[PDB]
Design a protein around this ligand. Sequence first.
Ligand SMILES: [Cl-]
Ligand SMILES: [Cl-]
Ligand SMILES: [Mg+2]
Ligand SMILES: [Mg+2]
Ligand SMILES: [Mg+2]
Ligand SMILES: [Mg+2]
Ligand SMILES: [Mg+2]
Ligand SMILES: [Mg+2]
Ligand SMILES: [Mg+2]
Ligand SMILES: [Mg+2]
Ligand SMILES: [Mg+2]
Ligand code: NA
Ligand code: NA
Ligand code: NA
Ligand code: NA
Ligand code: NA
Ligand code: NA
Lengths: 140, 95, 156, 154, 186
Amino acid sequence: FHEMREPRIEKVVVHMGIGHANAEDILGEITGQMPVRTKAKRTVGEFDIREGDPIGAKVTLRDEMAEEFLQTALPLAELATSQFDDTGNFSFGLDVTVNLVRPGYRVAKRDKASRSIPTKHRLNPADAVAFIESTYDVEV
Amino acid sequence: PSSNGPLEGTRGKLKNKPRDRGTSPPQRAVEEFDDGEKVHLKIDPSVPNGRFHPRFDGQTGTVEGKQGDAYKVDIVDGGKEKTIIVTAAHLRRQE
Amino acid sequence: KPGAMYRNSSKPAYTRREYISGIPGKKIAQFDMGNNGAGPTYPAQVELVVEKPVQIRHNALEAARVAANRYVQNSGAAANYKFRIRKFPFHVIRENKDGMRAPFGKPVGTAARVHGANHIFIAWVNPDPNVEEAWRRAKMKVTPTINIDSSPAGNA
Amino acid sequence: MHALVQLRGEVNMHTDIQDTLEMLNIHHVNHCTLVPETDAYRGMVAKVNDFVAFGEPSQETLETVLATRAEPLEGDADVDDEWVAEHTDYDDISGLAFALLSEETTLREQGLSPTLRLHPPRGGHDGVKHPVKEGGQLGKHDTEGIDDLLEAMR
Amino acid sequence: ATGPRYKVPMRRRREARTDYHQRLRLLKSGKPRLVARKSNKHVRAQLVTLGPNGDDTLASAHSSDLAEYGWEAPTGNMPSAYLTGLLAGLRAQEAGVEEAVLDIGLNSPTPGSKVFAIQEGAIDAGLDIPHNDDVLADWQRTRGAHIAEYDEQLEEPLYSGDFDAADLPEHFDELRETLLDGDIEL
RNA sequence: UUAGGCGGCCACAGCGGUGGGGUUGCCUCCCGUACCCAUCCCGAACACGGAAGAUAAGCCCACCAGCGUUCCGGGGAGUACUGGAGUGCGCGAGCCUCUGGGAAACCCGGUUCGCCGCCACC
RNA sequence: AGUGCAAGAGCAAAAGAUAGCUUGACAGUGUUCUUCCCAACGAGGAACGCUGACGCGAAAGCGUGGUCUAGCGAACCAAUU
RNA sequence: CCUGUCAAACUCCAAACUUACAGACGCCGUUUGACGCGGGGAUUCCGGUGCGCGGGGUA
Ligand SMILES: [Cl-]
Ligand SMILES: [Cl-]
Ligand SMILES: [Mg+2]
Ligand SMILES: [Mg+2]
Ligand SMILES: [Mg+2]
Ligand SMILES: [Mg+2]
Ligand SMILES: [Mg+2]
Ligand SMILES: [Mg+2]
Ligand SMILES: [Mg+2]
Ligand SMILES: [Mg+2]
Ligand SMILES: [Mg+2]
Ligand code: NA
Ligand code: NA
Ligand code: NA
Ligand code: NA
Ligand code: NA
Ligand code: NA
């Protein structure tokens, strides 16, 4: 049963929601791989009327690239609880989000016969706290 | 009528019931008919091409040759003889 | 203007406010009268039944209702009874006020279409039918002949 | 098998109703025809229901009327037993009558005019403004009802 | 689901198995379809025709029944695909089928992919199919050379037990060679 | 069909939920990036290569009706409406009778948790 | 939601969005329907072909302008190929 | 949750009925030639009423 039920880290998105950049540079070093532009939608008063327009960058890290990052990110954060997803995720911070899920997630991300993950096989906030808390730190 | 375009007074006949909404199955768009076969004409709201003038919706003609992938169906409008260019997507075998 | 001009249901239903503007407000003050705080927990229930399909201008509704409830003060301003007028004047009415040229009239009021046998008014009372009298005065100010019907009440 | 009698004239009667009567071989008031009870014929009589009188006649009545008002496809000749025997499959009016009623043959099949040109009803009929159930003479009749009319028009 | 007005997609669209827009375009040719499908471990190739109550498969080949002819290697690779293509192509010919169009289902038209290998195979089997040569692998990769070289960077057998240690694109030739004459079910 | 591929009808198949299933064989998740190929950044996906592990997802099998849907019984209802006829009634609006058709809402009880085709396969 | 603009209709692995590429908004000639139900009548419009030349795509295929129904003009004379 | 009402430019529903084609019966046509084709000659393009269904209008 377990082993295929035990949580794991799938991507950590580090993005800097600026309002118009030079910031990529630091993201590249803090993570270790190229950042991506962040176009925006809708025309708005913050002199942000331009539809297609660089307004920040993000970086999606997977596998070691994600751990090796969290092995310094997490320490710079304290928070926990309430600040967690209903799906077992959590964002802290410049933003750093951690998407968590169990072994058979590809089923919902592949092209052929894809499907949504059953609520039972989903990751709960609690089952999430455990996994991470059980990895160099404390909850609440 | 306040206007005289082809679609005048076609709100009903060219609209789908909410559940039959969306792209239609390909099977009937590929159906093949032989010259002489009787076919009922009925536009499929979901299928843009291969259409005929809404006034013929409900007619039952006789396939008589085709043009490209489109069929040529002979019908009789009132007392006049007419040939309609129509695709399988808008035809059905009688009986 | 006379009821004769609008009391018949011979015109198409004309109620689409999305295509009609300048409709006059309704003169009907309230639809729920009496102790609306309480629910129909009364022994007796009398109803005023219209006997012919007709149109009833909000004019008549107001005068009919007032004359009935205004009288139901034989029981007191805070008496124990609840009065209800279940119809609302949906049908918009016009008047062609040029002669018969471009005659589609302009909105001049509203009327409610009642079919013969429907109850336009329903009152709830304890064995104390002063209400039967409140209606003799009500159907006095509406076009049709009417039937005063009692439902829960075998206390005759 | 039902006996059809046109009781109302053509003036003002729907065309599609008149044609129907015409398809049933009746082209004048008081003219009568015999019609099988089939789906196709049933629809026809129902459409004509308001300008006619119909019902299943008794063996006797039919015989009376056949004897009195039957005719050859052409000519004056009286259709009596002898005629019937020397011209039809049957041996006498009764035999023909039975065959019509049991819908085994038809007036044409036996060289007879599809139409029994009846006489006005002696004593007058019940009215052509109300159906039977209302005291008139229109619509489906009783076998006893049809017989009276047929007999009065013998 | 939600109400009377709710629109439920076709079963094969819910299952995310059939792309109906592509299907129609495919059926336009009026020719049989060369259904090229894959599995983590195998590769299937069918020649389907249109029918009154559904498709009719007139000829097929599965990477599994490849061994039935002397295959002693994995079956979820390039050389496997090609041969299964050729195998289904031959059975296809036998069935009287002369032409078809390539249906790759929900797979991607990546150059040198296994579905195109399947297409190459079926073509060489004699089947006439609308194609484009420079979207196909360069023969060597089809033979399984890319895998042999990959085992050159050995240190540990690429194949757990299986057959050979340095693998065999030669075993590939032996098989194609075999399928190109006589033998049962062909 | 002890798990498969391509479909037809396109909710009777949707939504939600329970239970069961892989010892060699199938589908998966799964493991992994030298290659073909790939991410406006990530072998996530796509693509390729592969079996150390698992049946927890998916998937297949058996089942539940609470919601949505399909059909049926009984009731609503031969009601509402209506094709044909009337020197029937009504100041009129309109109604009635005869004849030929015939509903919707809703309630109560069943049904429905897909059916079928072709191919492949201990 | 979006799809340029009325109103009604079509559309979800798209007819919408993004990116890239491209100029089929191509030349020639027809069939049919419409304009004008039935039922004669022009310009215009549309659907569907063919011939030729191209664009894209692995390919089937798609492109005879914009998802569909409005956005149009005779003879005489001029200018233009 | 409970409770009170509507729609010519609303529709989860839904008639009667109208209508395309086909078969059956009927009726009709093959010396009264129908269905149809070609041609000659018109008149006509102020209409009205009843009933059913309407739209406008106090009527
Ligand atoms: Cl047309
Ligand atoms: Cl596949
Ligand atoms: Mg309509
Ligand atoms: Mg004679
Ligand atoms: Mg006398
Ligand atoms: Mg009399
Ligand atoms: Mg399980
Ligand atoms: Mg277009
Ligand atoms: Mg001039
Ligand atoms: Mg010029
Ligand atoms: Mg009509
Ligand atoms: Na559709
Ligand atoms: Na004026
Ligand atoms: Na009165
Ligand atoms: Na960019
Ligand atoms: Na499982
Ligand atoms: Na034209």
